[PDB]
Write a protein that binds this DNA or RNA. Structure first.
Length: 54
DNA sequence: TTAGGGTTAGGG
DNA sequence: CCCTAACCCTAA
């Protein structure tokens, strides 16, 4: 069952991009306690947030 | 391991 | 329902 992204998970990805730059998906995933999210999931999520103005 | 296009399921 | 966010596929 697919799981929608929480606003806390989205803020984690936002700070991880700030602290490490886009494309550093495996580095961002390790800097935050992401449970059930792969680095590819983080990259797809970032594309969604960019498109949704976030 | 990431980028970018393609695919699908679940919620608005 | 069915659009789209959450997925998958794969070159490099």
């Amino acid at each position: 069952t697919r799981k929608m992204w929480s606003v806390q998970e989205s803020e984690w990805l936002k700070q991880g991009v700030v602290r490490y730059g886009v494309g550093h998906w495996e580095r961002i995933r390790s800097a935050f306690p992401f449970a059930g999210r792969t680095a590819v999931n983080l990259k797809d999520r970032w594309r969604t947030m960019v498109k949704l103005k976030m």
